[PDB]
């Protein structure tokens, strides 16, 4: 002894690791007794040899148990603890409506979300466009908000699944991110630490998705669904489209505006609506708040129609120290960009292909995201009025409206938008927004 | 960029790395810009995918070039620069005679050796039993000793193949030691930094060897021979026996005594003689100091017979700040143990199997080696009068004479010696000391 190197060797030589070995290794990551080299070595053995179902479960549970795990029983709430997680995208703003919608339907949503990563936006960065909005309430306050409002959206504290922190940090510099067992354990370590009754997973497919192929997107969804259900959390996954921007906007303040306008019924992007509704439906059914799709949809449409979901969002924002009149007066609070100007295609035609990774990177380059952790976000910049696949573009229909922090910035963003979008003389074939549902 | 993660990914996905990529990665190890996690990740990709000949060569050359490389041309010596390296063993004292023997025959031997590792003794630790012996002469002094004496045995300075330092340190905690390309590059990075004309490699086979099987011992020898010859260093390897202790002793001071008594002709263990001579023969031939085996053997026997090799050893010890009368008066200088007592077998019979790894570990446990780097050696402890395979043991022939630092220590050593050696009613079949020679 000690065992860390022996455990690496065992996995290296193609053997399955025991629950005890996995727990020891995860603990050792948590308490800093296992080095970065050792983490990377194990991660690589897992890349090469994969992990069986028992191993995947052990890894996930160990990472979950490495820190604080929330429990809701003692509040004696009369509703299920339910959440959603997405693999991320561009204009993937669903959580901002979905949380309030499901809460208005009787669910409790303790959503620990994330900042932007790579080319993708992050729900916490979008929320931080709201002046005063506090993503880090203390333990007692978080519980008060969940009890009173039904939903809160918060950051990952240093006490939540801490073994995941160094594991991911190491994976991200050693080409060991791309492993289904490691991805699965990382996602669920955090979500399962919320003390959920039920969970829905949104796994994106297409050019702006995490997994490279449809089959691997599928494989990831099955793994997450398998592990979460084994942990007693009723879980399903939807494979949804990220071959274009999901909302009509991409950024931070611009996406918060879209969320508010969606909740109030001013404007609803139909694809964003379809994905948001479908995910909410899974949550209601898995949470036993509805018996079928039709009943779930009726309940969710009702809270949109009667303004209850918008009201919950307002109460959430106020509870998390944003303005008390935010829904009514968001225009006064959300920062406006220096220059807002449409970008037009060089030719007339149908929008045929849009490289959503490139669009996401264009928002980063505008200052709407980060290349390194220390980077500061400009909350105003981004895109609105996104053209969709199959839209005819000309002088009366731009590719997008670009919100930029100065004129030099605008020119670069316009170049990137045009480069990311291909036109054709015919509209592309339509594609489902939701490709399939994966259940236990 | 930067490229470190991209290089890991490339190797991870089964592609061969270019010379440029390998050099960049090695430089990055040297200058501390590539992390332990990244080193371990690459090491593991190499464990799984191996390396082609060009990759192995690139890796070796890059590690060699990461620090100081010695050049001897400017001294205008009239002889080849030649050296030996062993994979290590128990009683593997050959260097102490071989250096002086080859120097007396016209060779120049700038031997950068090592300390004990795992169960194996180390030439530098044996030499440090000699009072005043300095394994770290400065650059100008090392050159003076080589020119005047023909041989010196020294430690690895912080400037020699420094990329190998962190690479090995990481391998040794991540189960990535056991890789032929990595082992090959590590050995040759150091030896090739000596500026050699020729080299002989001693690859051990058996229970006290580095590689687990004969085939892998063979595979390692072929790799080292291939890479070294490609670098313009005339190199061969011998596969030699480590199924028992090679010398009649194991330890530090005890092995130095054996070396002196071998050189003076008082006593020569015949197996130690066979291996020492065979390695020296390779050096003379590869170094162009003899045209065939018979001529080489005659020259080497001559310098033993006329006392010239013993004289060179004496001059080496004096030049490296040991006593000027060491050969003549070694008894006064080499420390004696507190208790020296024979250990007898529990039964009469023939020595049939001896676990040389266990014998090596027994010397460590006695205080004659280290479990961690900070450990202090007792230079007096160890074994002499080792029984050989096929020896009849009884009340008139012990398994060994144990030199111990106190009586409690002796009892434990005696237990370990008896546990490591199996007796039989018949002598085991004889085995060659040298199994085969590998050349380009």
Cα nearest neighbour of A48 on chain B: B48
CA–CA separation, A227 vs A56, rounded Å?
7
Contacts of A29 (CB under 8 A, 6+ apart): A39, A66, A163, A166, A167
Determine whether the interchain pair B173/A9 forms a contact, defined as Cβ–Cβ distance below 8 Å.
no
Does the annotation mark B129 as catalytic? no
Q: What angle do CA A105, A111, A112 make, to 5 degrees?
A: 175
Distant-in-sequence, close-in-space partners of B337: CB < 8 Å, separation ≥ 6 = B378, B380, B381, B403, B404, B405
Other C-beta atoms closer than 10 Å to the C-beta of A20 total 12
| Opening angle at CA B301, ends B300 and B306, nearest 5 | 105
Q: Which residue has the tokens 């897992």?
A: A46
- Which chain B residues are closer than 8 Å to A176 by Cβ? 41
Interface contact flag, A12 B44, Cβ < 8 Å:
yes
Burial (CB < 10 A; 0-12, 13-18, 19+), residue A138, is: exposed
Q: Find which of B6, B13, B25, B40 to mutate to test the A interface (most A CBs within 10 Å of its CB).
A: B40
Separation CA B185–CA B176 (nearest Å): 13
Taking contacts as CB-CB distances below 8 angstroms, the residues of chain A near B47 are 12
Count interface pairs A-B at CB distance under 8 A.
70
Q: With CB atoms and an 8 Å threshold, state whether B36 touches A40.
A: yes
The crossing angle, in degrees rounded to 10, of helices B94-104 and B293-305 is 100
Cα within 13 Å of Cα(B381), Cβ side: 24
| C-beta atoms surrounding B154 within 10 Å | 21
Tokens 């030049």 correspond to what residue? B319
Burial of residue B427 (CB within 10 Å: 0-12, 13-18, 19+) is middle
* CA distance linking residue B308 with residue B304, whole number of Å: 6
Alpha helices in B66-172 (DSSP H): 94-104, 123-127, 139-149, 162-171
Contact B317, B311 (CB under 8 A): no
Q: Looking only at Cα atoms, what is the longest distance across chain B?
A: 72
d(C-alpha A87, C-alpha A221), whole Å: 10
Nearest Cα residue in chain A from B38: A174
In Å, how far is A5's CA from the nearest CA of chain B?
5
Q: Contact at 8 Å (CB) between A236 and A438?
A: yes
Which of B5, B14, B41 to probe the A interface (max A CBs under 10 A)?
A: B41
Partner residue facing B39 (CB), from A9, A37, A45: A37
Is B426 a known active-site residue?
no
| Beta strand ranges found along B227-380 (DSSP E) | 234-241, 250-251, 339-343, 349-354
A415: CB partners within 8 A, 6+ apart: none
Q: What share of chain B is helix, strand, coil (3-state, %, to 5)?
A: 45, 15, 40
Residue of A nearest to B45 (CA): A44
Give the separation between CA A262 and CA A278, rounded to whole angstroms. 15
Residues 6+ apart with CB under 8 A from A81: A72, A107, A108, A109, A110, A194, A195, A196, A197, A198
Which domains occur in chain A, in start order? 1-69+156-193 (1.20.970.10), 70-155+194-336 (3.40.1030.10), 337-433 (3.90.1170.30)
Beta strand pairing call for B151-154 and B109-112? parallel
Task: Calculate the CA dihedral of residues B183, B185, B190, B195 and round it to 10 degrees.
Answer: 140
Chain B residues inside the 8 Å CB shell of A44: 12, 40-41, 44-45, 48
CA nearest to A420, candidates A362, A355, A361: A355
Give chain A's end-to-end CA distance (angstroms, integer): 40
Q: Which of A5, A170, A176 sits opposite B175 (nearest CB)?
A: A5
Q: How far is CA B392 from the centre of its chain?
A: 30
Choose from A1, A7, A15, A40 for mutation: most chain B CBs within 10 A: A40
Distance from CA of B299 to the nearest CA of A (A): 48
DSSP notation for B337-352: PSEEEEE--SS-EEEE
- Of B45, B66, B86, B176, which residue is the catalytic one? B86
Hey, is A363 helix, strand or coil? helix
- Give, for B83, the enclosing helix (H) or strand (E): strand B82-86
Between the alpha carbon of residue B232 and those of residues B185, B196, B235, the distances in Å are 15, 9, 9
Q: Which three-class secondary structure state does DSSP give residue B403?
A: strand
The helices-and-strands tally (H runs, E runs) of chain A is 17, 13
Phi and psi dihedrals of B397, rounded to 5? -150, 100
Pairing type for strands A234-241 and A250-251 reads: unpaired
Which residues on adjacent β-strands are paired with residue A404? A339
Asked whether B75 and B148 are in contact (CB, 8 A), the reply is: no
Q: What does DSSP assign to residue B119?
A: T
Q: What's the angle, vertex CA B416, arms to CA B412 and CA B420, rounded to 5?
A: 175
Q: Which two tokens stand for residue B181?
A: 């390309």
Which residues lie closer than 8 Å to A391 by C-beta, 6 or more apart?
A: A350, A351, A397
Q: Which of A5, A38, A174 sits opposite B38 (nearest CB)?
A: A174
Q: Do A174 and B41 touch (CB under 8 A)?
A: yes
> Distance from A66 to chain B by nearest Cα, in Å?
21
A88/A96 Cα distance (integer angstroms): 14
- Binary contact (B174, A37; C-beta < 8 A): yes
CA dihedral of residues A360, A361, A366, A369 (deg, nearest 10): 70
* Spatial distance between the Cα atoms of A203 and A275, rounded to a whole number of angstroms: 11
A170 CB neighbours in chain B (<8 A) are 37
Task: Look up residue B394 and give its two tokens.
Answer: 């009884």
Q: Which two tokens stand for residue B283?
A: 């050096």
- Closest Cβ opposite residue B44 in set A44, A170, A173: A44
- How far apart (Å, rounded) are the C-alpha atoms in residues B218 and B241? 13
- Are A6 and A41 in contact, with CB atoms under 8 Å apart? no
Question: B436 an active-site residue?
Answer: no
Annotated catalytic residue: which of B123, B170, B380, B384? B123
Name the residue facing B41 among A9, A35, A40 (closest C-beta).
A40
B65: closest CA among B182, B176, B156, B185? B185
What is the chain A residue with the closest CA to B39? Answer: A37
Compute the distance between CA of residue B133 and CA of residue B314 in angstroms, rounded to an integer. 12
Angle at A315 between CA A311 and CA A317, to 5 degrees: 115
d(CA B124, CA A111): 61
Strands B198-205 and B151-154: unpaired
- The residues, ordered by sequence, that sit 6+ positions from B373 with a Cβ below 8 Å of its Cβ are none
Within 10 angstroms of residue A251's Cβ, the number of other Cβ atoms is 33
Contact in structure between A154 and A113 (CB atoms under 8 Å): yes
Q: Which helix (H) or strand (E) holds A435?
A: strand A434-438
- The per-residue b/e assignment along A355-385, b for 16 or more CB within 10 angstroms, e otherwise, is bbbbbbbbbbbbbbbbeeeeeebbbbbbbbe
Would the CA dihedral through B431, B432, B434, B438 be positive or negative?
A: negative
By CB atoms closer than 10 A (0-12, 13-18, 19+), residue B324 is middle
Q: Helix or strand or coil: residue A358?
A: helix
**CA–CA gap between residue B143 and residue B161 (Å, rounded):** 19
Sort residue A107 into left (φ over 0), alpha (ψ -120 to 50) or beta: beta
Give the burial class of A310: count Cβ atoms within 10 A of its Cβ; 0-12 exposed, 13-18 middle, 19 or more buried.
buried
Q: How far is B2 from chain A (nearest CA, A)?
A: 11
A215 class by beta-carbon count within 10 Å (0-12 exposed, 13-18 middle, 19+ buried): exposed
Coil/strand/helix, residue A284: helix
CB contact (8 A) between residue B40 and residue A45:
no
Region of A132 (left: φ > 0; alpha: ψ -120 to 50; beta: rest) is left
Phi, psi of A93 (to 5 degrees): -90, 10
Closest C-alpha to B387, from B437, B336, B348: B348
Structure tokens at B260: 């002196």
Whole-number Å distance between alpha carbons of B291 and B90: 32
CA atoms of A178 and B176, how far apart (whole Å) = 21
Distance of CA A216 to the CA centre of its chain: 18
- Do the Cβ atoms of A44 and B170 come within 8 Å? no
* Spatial separation of the C-alpha atoms in residues A194 and B183, rounded to whole Å: 47
Q: Using the 8-state DSSP alphabet, how is residue B74 labeled?
A: G
B9: distance to nearest CA of chain A, Å?
5
Q: How far lies A23's CA from each of A4, A45, B228, in Å?
A: 11, 17, 45
- A403-A406-A411-A417 Cα dihedral, nearest 10 degrees: -30
Catalytic residues of A: 83-86, 123, 171, 186, 190-191
Spell A59-69 as b/e; 16+ CB within 10 A means b: bbbbbbbbbee
Q: How far apart are CA B305 and CA B290, in angstroms?
A: 18
Q: Tokens 């309430």, residue?
A: A137
Chain B residues whose C-beta is within 8 A of a chain A C-beta are 4-5, 8-9, 12, 35-41, 43-45, 47-48, 170, 173-176
Run of H or E residues at A198: strand A198-205
Q: Which of B36, B41, B173 has its CB closest to that of A44?
A: B41
Query: Burial of B138 by CB count in 10 Å (0-12 exposed, 13-18 middle, 19+ buried)?
Result: exposed
Q: Which long-range contacts (CB under 8 A, 24 or more apart) does A272-275 make?
A: A272/A91, A272/A93, A272/A94, A272/A246, A272/A247, A272/A248, A274/A433, A274/A434, A275/A94, A275/A202, A275/A238, A275/A240, A275/A241, A275/A246, A275/A433, A275/A434
Q: Which of B123, B149, B148 is nearest to B135 (CA)?
A: B123
Q: Which among A4, A36, A175 has CB closest to B5?
A: A175
Per-residue tokens: B166: 């962190």
Q: What is the secondary structure of B426-440 as a DSSP string? A: SPPPP--SEEEEE--
The full DSSP string for A100-141 is HHHHHTT-BEEEE----BTTB--HHHHHTTSTT--S---HHH
């Amino acid at each position: 002894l000690f065992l860390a190197q022996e455990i690496i060797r065992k996995k290296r030589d193609g053997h399955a690791l025991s629950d005890e070995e996995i727990r020891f290794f995860i603990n050792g990551i948590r308490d800093n007794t296992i080095s970065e080299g050792q983490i990377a070595a194990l991660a690589m053995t897992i890349f090469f040899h994969d992990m069986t179902m028992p191993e995947r479960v052990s890894l996930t549970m160990a990472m979950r148990d490495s820190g604080t795990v929330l429990d809701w029983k003692s509040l004696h709430l009369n509703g299920p603890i339910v959440d959603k997680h997405s693999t991320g995208g561009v204009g993937d703003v669903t959580s901002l409506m979905l949380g309030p919608m499901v809460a208005a339907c009787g669910g409790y949503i303790p959503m620990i979300s994330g900042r932007g990563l790579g080319h993708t936006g992050g729900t916490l960065d979008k929320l931080e466009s709201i002046p005063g909005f506090d993503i880090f309430p203390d333990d007692n306050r978080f519980r008060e908000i969940i009890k009173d409002v039904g939903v809160a959206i918060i950051g990952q504290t240093s006490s939540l699944a801490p073994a995941d922190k160094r594991f991911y940090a190491t994976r991200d510099i050693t080409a060991t991110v791309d492993s289904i067992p490691l991805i699965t354990a990382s996602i669920l370590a955090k979500k399962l630490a919320e003390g959920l009754d039920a969970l829905v997973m949104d796994v994106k497919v297409g050019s702006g998705a995490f997994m490279p192929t449809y089959e691997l997107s599928e494989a990831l969804a099955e793994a997450i669904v398998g592990v979460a259900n084994g942990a007693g959390v009723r879980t399903t996954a939807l494979l949804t489209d990220m071959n274009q921007v999901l909302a009509s906007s991409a950024g931070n303040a611009v996406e918060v505006r879209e969320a508010v306008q969606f909740l109030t019924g001013e404007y609803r992007n139909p694809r964003l609506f379809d994905v948001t509704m479908a995910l909410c439906v899974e949550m209601l059914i898995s949470g036993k708040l509805a018996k079928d799709d039709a009943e779930a949809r009726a309940k969710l449409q009702a809270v949109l129609d009667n303004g209850k979901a918008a009201e919950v969002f307002g109460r959430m924002v106020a509870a998390q120290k944003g303005p008390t009149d935010f829904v009514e007066n968001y225009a006064k609070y959300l920062p406006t960009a220096m220059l807002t100007k449409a970008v037009y295609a060089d030719t007339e035609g149908f929008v045929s292909e849009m490289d959503t990774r490139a669009l996401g990177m264009a928002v980063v380059a505008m200052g709407g995201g980060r290349r390194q952790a220390s980077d500061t976000i400009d909350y105003s910049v981004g895109f609105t009025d996104m053209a969709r696949l199959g839209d005819q573009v000309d002088g009366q229909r731009p590719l997008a409206v670009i919100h930029a922090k100065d004129e030099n910035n605008w020119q670069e963003a316009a170049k990137a938008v045009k480069a990311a979008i291909k036109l054709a003389d015919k509209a592309p074939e339509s594609t489902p927004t939701v490709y399939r549902r994966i259940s236990e």
